[PDB]
Every structure is written in structure tokens, then in C-alpha cells.
Amino acid sequence: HWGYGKHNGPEHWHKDFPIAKGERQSPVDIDTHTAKYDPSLKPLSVSYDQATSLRILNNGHAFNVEFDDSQDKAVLKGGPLDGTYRLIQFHFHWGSLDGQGSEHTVDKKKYAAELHLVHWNTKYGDFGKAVQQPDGLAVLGIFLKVGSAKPGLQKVVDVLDSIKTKGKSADFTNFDPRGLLPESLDYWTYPGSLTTPPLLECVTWIVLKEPISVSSEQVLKFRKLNFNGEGEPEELMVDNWRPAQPLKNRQIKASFK
Ligand SMILES: CCCc1c(F)c(F)c(S(N)(=O)=O)c(F)c1F
Ligand SMILES: OC[C@H]1O[C@@H](O)[C@H](O)[C@@H](O)[C@@H]1O
Ligand SMILES: [Zn+2]
């Protein structure tokens, strides 16, 4: 199956997922000079006060922190979005070294990692139906740089030892995703896709301009996870990022002047 190595990574995905060469693939490089302020964007509303985290899972590609999405407990609205999008999970992409790891780039600069908060459009009733729609998903992307520690990330870091290998999960209740946000909600937005197979072109991307800072020790613990399952030879879970894809007939809009 697909992965991030030389024999099953991003340059191979198109053979089983031909949309990999499609017209609105993600991630992309964000050329900050070409992005244009869009006065039609409404204020962005991140409403995570009632979020209910449930579980953390190593899926062999990354780790997902999963939420209860049976009600509008944690929703994203506003900005470029029409209606209400419900948080289902978050996960990260990261590198083997601090100089790489993000999927989106900013004037070609790669960050050490990138956080994705995945939301589905409630007008479609379930995530599965949402990924049949051009406006089915909204992903809030947040860059990570290495500097001071992020206190709100530490609970995630400390549980990773219990989900080292593919297929392991652990209870992860009462986690507040608000502790992963930067101060500013200035953002860039464009239409794109899932960055993992099946690469479906369903996503409104909202990428925050301000990175969060995490400590070297925190990201080093990400890099101790394993792509492999228990009992199998160790393949460190690093460099689980897709590189930037062609922008094609798209414009990136900025929320800020
Ligand atoms: C495959 C369905 C689950 C899933 C998403 F919905 C999604 F949006 C992303 S991403 N990197 O584009 O944010 C994923 F990596 C991912 F695995
Ligand atoms: O025709 C002019 C229009 O061109 C579009 O490509 C831009 O997104 C708009 O901001 C601009 O007003
Ligand atoms: Zn992602």
C-alpha cells in the first residue's frame, strides 16, 4: 500500500490514484507576493470550546487525534466557508530534521512540521458523503517551527510512547485543541485536495500565516513513532509529507491586507 518511502511514496501515488495529477491538488507553495487580499472573506470563526476528543491512533502514516462529531461540538465557520464545518480529527506531518516536514511552503520555505485540523461540511451529513463533494471539507493548517515549547502540545507528545506502532490507539479524552493555535488567525485560502491518498479534491484549505513554536524535544518525540506494526523491523515515522503540487488554475487569497 501507499506510504512515504522511495518505493511507495508521493511520486508513485498516481498509479493507483490518478487524481494525483489533477487540477486542484494539495499542498502548494504559497507565493506571498502573488496572494491577494480578499475583502469578500467574512471573519473566520474557530469555535472549539465544546470539543470532545476521544482517542489517538497511529494509522501507519501519522497519528490522528479523533473527536466526537455526532453534534456541532467543535466547528469552523466564516472566512471562505459557506455554512458549518465540524471537526473530526487532527494530525501532523513532519520531517526527519527541522529543515523539512511541512506540506505547504511559504515562498518555498519549508517548516519543521504542519498541523491539520480536518472538518466536514454538515450539509452533507457524514464525512463519507462530504468527500463526494467539491466543498465537502475544510482543513485548517498551522505551521510548526522549533523554538520554545508549546505547552498545549505536551499531552500529545507524552502519549506517543503508547502508540508507537501502526494500529495502536489510546484513550485521549479531554484534550483542548485551542492550545495548538497561534495568536493570530490571519490566513491564506485556496481550493485543493486531501494530501494523502485517495487525494480527493474536496478541500477548502485555510492555512494560518503565524506558525506555532514547539521545542526540539517535542518534535524529536514525533520522530520516535514507527510506520511499521508491532514486531516488525523499525521504520521511523519521519518525512510523512507530500511536496508542493502545481497550482494550475488557482489563486491564493489572503485574509489580511
Ligand atoms: C483520508 C481521509 C482522512 C484525511 C483527511 F480528511 C485529510 F483532510 C487529510 S489532509 N492531510 O489533507 O489534511 C488527511 F491526511 C487524511 F488522512
Ligand atoms: O477580472 C478581475 C478579477 O480577476 C480575478 O482573477 C481576481 O481574483 C479578482 O480579484 C479580480 O477582481
Ligand atoms: Zn494532513
Return the residue whose CA atom lies nearest to atom 11 of ligand 1.
195
Q: Is 68 exposed, middle or buried (0-12, 13-18, 19+ CB in 10 A)?
A: middle
Distance 191 CA to ligand 2 centre (A): 16
Annotated binding site for substrate: 195-196
Residue 34: CB within 6 Å of ligand 2?
A: no
Q: Are 128 and 149 in contact (CB under 8 A)?
A: no
Residue 45: CB within 6 Å of ligand 2?
A: no
Resolution for this experimental structure (Å)? 1.1
7 is catalytic: no
Q: Report d(CA 79, CA 257) in Å as an integer.
A: 14
Q: Are 202 and 174 in contact (CB under 8 A)?
A: no
Distance 204 CA to ligand 2 centre (A): 19
Annotated binding site: 91, 93, 116, 195-196
C-alpha cell at 177: 485543541
Q: Technique behind this structure?
A: X-ray
Residues with Cβ within 8 Å of residue 40, at least 6 apart in sequence? none
Distance 189 CA to ligand 2 centre (A): 15
Phi, psi (rounded to 5 degrees) for 154: -65, -35
Residues with Cβ within 8 Å of residue 116, at least 6 apart in sequence? 90, 91, 92, 93, 139, 140, 141, 195
Residue 251: CB within 6 Å of ligand 2?
A: yes
C-alpha cell at 255: 485574509
Virtual CA dihedral for 221, 222, 226, 231, nearest 10 degrees? 30
Q: Are 192 and 201 in contact (CB under 8 A)?
A: yes
Measured CA to CA in angstroms, residue 154 lies from 10, 106, 157, 160, 177 at distances of 30, 26, 5, 10, 12
Q: Report d(CA 91, CA 101) in Å as an integer.
A: 13
Grid look-up 467543535 returns 74
Distance 137 CA to ligand 1 centre (A): 9
Distance 141 CA to ligand 1 centre (A): 11
Please identify, by atom number, the ligand 2 atom nearest to the C-alpha of residue 253: 8
3-class DSSP string for 83-147: CCEEEEEEEEEECCCCCCCCCCEECCECCCEEEEEEEEEHHHCCHHHHCCCCCCEEEEEEEEEEC
Strands (E), 147-245: 169-171, 187-192, 203-208, 212-214
Q: Report d(CA 210, CA 143) in Å as an integer.
A: 7
Please identify, by atom number, the ligand 2 atom nearest to the C-alpha of residue 38: 10
Closest C-alpha among 57, 95, 115 to residue 237: 95
Long-range contacts of 130-133 (CB under 8 A, 24+ apart): 130/202, 131/194, 131/200, 131/202, 132/202, 133/202
Residues with Cβ within 8 Å of residue 158, at least 6 apart in sequence? none
Phi, psi (rounded to 5 degrees) for 48: -110, 10
Residue 115: CB within 6 Å of ligand 1?
A: no
Give the closest ligand to the alpha carbon of residue 59: 1
Q: Is 73 exposed, middle or buried (0-12, 13-18, 19+ CB in 10 A)?
A: middle
Q: Report d(CA 157, CA 163) in Å as an integer.
A: 11
Q: Is 257 exposed, middle or buried (0-12, 13-18, 19+ CB in 10 A)?
A: exposed
Closest C-alpha among 220, 96, 89 to residue 149: 220
Residue 32: CB within 6 Å of ligand 2?
A: no
Which one from 14, 33, 61, 119 is the annotated catalytic residue? 61
Q: Which of 37, 251, 253 to mutate to test the pocket of ligand 2 (most atoms within 8 A of CB)?
A: 251
Closest C-alpha among 144, 112, 124, 24 to residue 69: 124
DSSP H or E stretch at residue 253: strand 253-254
